[PDB]
Amino acid sequence: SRLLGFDSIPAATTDTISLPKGYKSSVLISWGQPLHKNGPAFDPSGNGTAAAQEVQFGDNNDGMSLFEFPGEKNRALMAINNEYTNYRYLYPHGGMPQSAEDVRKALACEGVSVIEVQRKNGQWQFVQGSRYNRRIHGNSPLRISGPAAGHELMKTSADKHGKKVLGTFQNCANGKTPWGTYLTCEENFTDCFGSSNAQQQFDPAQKRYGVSAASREINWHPFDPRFDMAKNPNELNRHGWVVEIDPFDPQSTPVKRTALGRFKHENAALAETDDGRAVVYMGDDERGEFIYKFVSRDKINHRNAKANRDILDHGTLYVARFDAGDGNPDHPKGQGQWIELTHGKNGIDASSGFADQAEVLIHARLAASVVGATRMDRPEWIVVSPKDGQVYCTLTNNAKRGEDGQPVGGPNPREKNVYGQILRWRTDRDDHASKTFAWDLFVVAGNPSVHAGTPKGGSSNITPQNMFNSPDGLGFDKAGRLWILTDGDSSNAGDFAGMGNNQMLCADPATGEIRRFMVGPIGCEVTGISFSPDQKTLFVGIQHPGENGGSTFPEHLPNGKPRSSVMAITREDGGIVGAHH
C-alpha cells in the first residue's frame, strides 16, 4: 500500500501501549492535572474536592481537536471532552454519590478541558498556567441559542426565560469548525436524570429518549434536585445538544446550538457545500436510532472568522434513509437520501405532535420517525475525507438487530451484531448540498478465526492478523489515511478470541486494506484523535483504563490508580505518523 507505511502489529492483552517498530508514546496530560498556576495537585486517595476538580483536567477524556495558534508554529490549543467519571476511583468509598458535594465532584469531572500545548525540542507538552487553560464543566453557566431558545419546553424554575443552562456533561465526541471554534457533543445525558417519585409517569418524548426514575446508575437526583424529573422535568430538554466553544477566548460563554437538533450526539463532522454553506453530519448513538445532517442558511465567511458567530443558528436539519442495497454479502452497496425535519413538511405538524419548529428540534427523534428515517446499528463517529469528500460512519454494534422493528438489511446486514461495520457515502456530484448519495459498507467487522466463512467472519478485508470489534472513533490525517479507534469487548474470548485489548488501526480508503497500529492498556477504550499541523505527532486518548480494576496505567505506581490520559504518539526518526520510513 501507498498510504500504509508500517507493518500491522499483533493484538495484545498487556497493561501498556503497543506500537510498531520505530514508534514511541508519551503522556501529554491525565485526569486530575491542575490547569492553573499553583493549582491543586491530583490526590490519588480519592479525597480531592469538587472545587479542586473544577480547576483540574476532567475524567474519561474522549473527543478532541487541536487548534493552530495564529502566527506561532510552536504553540497550539487543544479542546478535550470529559465524558463521564469512574466512581470506583473518584471517591474514597468507590461507590455511588453519598452527598451533594459528591454530586458536584462528578459534574466537575465532565465537560471540556481547554489546554495550551507548546513544542519544545520537537515534543509537544502541556503548558500549565496558560491564559487559555480552562475547565467548562457540568455546572458551568452556558447560553442557549437557535430556534428552541426561549421556548416553553426549555423553561425551568431556575431559568424562567429558557436561554441560560447550567453546564455541558456526557461530552462524547467533537467538531472543529473552519471559523476557529470547537463543537462538543452531549451523548448519554439522559443517564443523569432520575425521579424521587419511583412511579413517575413519563410522556412519549421522555420515553423515546430513555429516561428512567432510577437513573442509569448515576444517582445525582437524590442529592441535586436539578436532575430530579419530579421537580425539574424540563431540565431533560436543556441537554442533548451540540455546544459551540471558542478556545481562543477564555472569557467567552459557550452556546448550545438548538438548530442542530436534540439527541444522543456522538460527534459532528464538518463539510462545505459547493455554494459555500456549512454542513454538519451527526450520529445519534443508540440501537436503532438515526444519522442526521445540518446545512447552514449562510455561506461560511473564511476571511472573517467572527462574521460566522450565528452561522449554526440558521439552516435545515435532515435525517437519512438508506435503501436495501444490492445484498452483496462482502460489500453491499446502494443509494440513500436526506429527508428534511421542518415543521409543516413531510407530515411534521400539530397532527403528528409538533406545535412549532422548536418542538421539531427538541424532539428530533420523534420527527425523524414520522418521516421514515432508517434505523441504524449505533452510529458513532463520522468523518469527511479531506482528499475526496467521501463520508465514513461507524456502526459500532447492535445486539437487537433482527428484533421486531429493526429488520436485517442494507447497511445493517447481520442479526445480533456484536462486531459492527463502517459505512461510507459519496454525496451526489460530490456536492454536500445534494439530497441523495451512494452508500457502501467499507468494512464489516468479524472474527474469521472462529467464524470462518460466515457473516460473523466479517468482510474479506478483515483477516485473522487485523481483526477488531466495535469500531467507534475515526479520524483522517492530511495524507488521507483513515484511523479507526475501537471501543469493544476486550475479553479476548468467545466471539472475540484473538482480538485482545482495544486498539487503533489504519486503513487505505481506495484499497480497503486495514492494519493494526496500536493496542491500548487493560480495561480502556481508545478514543479521541488529533494531529499536530505537521502530522509528526498523533494525539490519542486512553479512556477509563482499569474500568474493571486491572490497570495502574500510565504511571504504574505501586497500588496505583489508573488515569484516563491523552497520549502523544511519535516516530523516533521524527517522520510523519503512519507514513513510510
Ligand X SMILES: Nc1ncnc2c1ncn2[C@@H]1O[C@H](COP(=O)(O)OP(=O)(O)CP(=O)(O)O)[C@@H](O)[C@H]1O
**Which CB, 258 or 396, lies closer to ligand X?**
396
Cβ burial 407-444 (10 Å sphere, 16+ → b, else e): eebbbbbbeebbbbbbbbbbbeeeebbeeebebbbbbb
DSSP-derived 3-state class of residue 249: coil
> Pick from ligand X, Ca ion, none: which does 174 bind, CB < 5 to 8 A by kind?
none
What's the min distance (Å) between Cβ of 239 and Ca ion? 18
> Pick from ligand X, Ca ion, none: which does 359 bind, CB < 5 to 8 A by kind?
none
Q: What is the dihedral of CA 467, 469, 473, 476, to 10 degrees?
A: 20
What's the min distance (Å) between Cβ of 175 and ligand X? 17
**Which CB, 77 or 211, lies closer to ligand X?**
211
> Contact with Ca ion (CB under 5 A): which of 186, 191, 472, 477?
472
What's the min distance (Å) between Cβ of 570 and ligand X? 27
What's the min distance (Å) between Cβ of 271 and Ca ion? 21
Residues 146-205 that bind Ca ion (CB under 5 A): none
Cα–chain center distance at 98: 29
**Which CB, 286 or 477, lies closer to ligand X?**
286
Residue 200, number of CB atoms within 10 A of its CB: 17
What's the min distance (Å) between Cβ of 286 and ligand X? 5
Rounded distance, CA 129 to CA 56, Å? 12
In whole angstroms, how far apart are CA 443 and each of 34, 127, 482? 41, 40, 12
What's the min distance (Å) between Cβ of 405 and ligand X? 15
**Which CB, 186 or 487, lies closer to ligand X?**
487
**Which CB, 126 or 468, lies closer to ligand X?**
468
Rounded distance, CA 141 to CA 551, Å? 35
What's the min distance (Å) between Cβ of 263 and ligand X? 12
**Which CB, 226 or 378, lies closer to ligand X?**
378
Residue 321, number of CB atoms within 10 A of its CB: 18
Residues in touch with ligand X (CB under 6 A): 172, 187-188, 216, 285-286, 378, 396, 472, 487
Decide: 500 and 464 in contact? Cβ < 8 Å: no
What's the min distance (Å) between Cβ of 401 and ligand X? 13
User: Checking phi first, is residue 491 left (phi over 0); if not, alpha (psi -120 to 50) or beta?
Assistant: alpha
**Which CB, 188 or 459, lies closer to ligand X?**
188
Residues in CB range of 95: below 8 A, 6 or more apart: 87, 88
Q: Which span sits near Ca ion by CB under 5 A: 26-34, 43-51, 469-477, 556-564?
A: 469-477
**Which CB, 116 or 187, lies closer to ligand X?**
187
What's the min distance (Å) between Cβ of 396 and ligand X? 6
Question: Could you tell me where the beta strands, DSSP code E, fall in 83-205?
Answer: 111-120, 123-126, 134-137, 141-145, 164-166, 171-176, 182-186
Cα–chain center distance at 183: 10
Residues in CB range of 276: below 8 A, 6 or more apart: 299, 300
Residues 502-561 that bind Ca ion (CB under 5 A): 525
Total number of residues that touch Ca ion (CB under 5 A):
3
Q: 3-state secondary structure string, 479-532?
A: CCCEEEEECCCCCCCHHHCCCCCCEEEEECCCCCCEEEEEECCCCCEEEEEEEC
> Pick from Ca ion, ligand X, none: which does 188 bind, CB < 5 to 8 A by kind?
ligand X
Cell digits of residue 477: 490525517
User: What is the DSSP annotation of 175-233?
Assistant: EE-TTS-EEEEE-SGGGG-B-S-TT----HHHHHHT--SS-SS---TTT-GGGBTTT-G
What residues are designated binding site for Ca(2+)?
266, 380, 472, 487, 525
By DSSP bridging, strand 182-186 and strand 242-245 are: antiparallel
Question: Could you tell me where the beta strands, DSSP code E, fall in 33-170?
Answer: 61-68, 75-82, 111-120, 123-126, 134-137, 141-145, 164-166
Q: Which span sits near Ca ion by CB under 5 A: 37-45, 50-58, 145-153, 479-487?
A: 479-487
What residues are designated binding site?
266, 380, 472, 487, 525
First-to-last C-alpha distance (Å) of the chain: 13
Cell 473544577 sits on residue: 54
Whose CA is closest to 290, among 202, 392, 371?
371
Residue 571, number of CB atoms within 10 A of its CB: 22
**Which CB, 159 or 187, lies closer to Ca ion?**
187
Cα–chain center distance at 77: 19
Using CB positions, name the residue nearest to Ca ion.
487
> Pick from ligand X, Ca ion, none: which does 216 bind, CB < 5 to 8 A by kind?
ligand X
What's the min distance (Å) between Cβ of 45 and ligand X? 27
**Which CB, 413 or 523, lies closer to ligand X?**
523
Q: Which span sits near Ca ion by CB under 5 A: 68-76, 199-207, 218-226, 487-495?
A: 487-495
Give the type of residue at 505: L
**Which CB, 286 or 313, lies closer to ligand X?**
286
What's the min distance (Å) between Cβ of 487 and ligand X? 5
The site map against Ca ion for 420-459 (x = CB under 5 A) is ----------------------------------------
* E strand or H helix at 283: strand 277-284
> Contact with Ca ion (CB under 5 A): which of 116, 235, 313, 487?
487
Please tell me whether residue 284 binds Ca ion under the rule CB under 5 A: no
Residues that bind Ca ion (CB under 5 A): 472, 487, 525
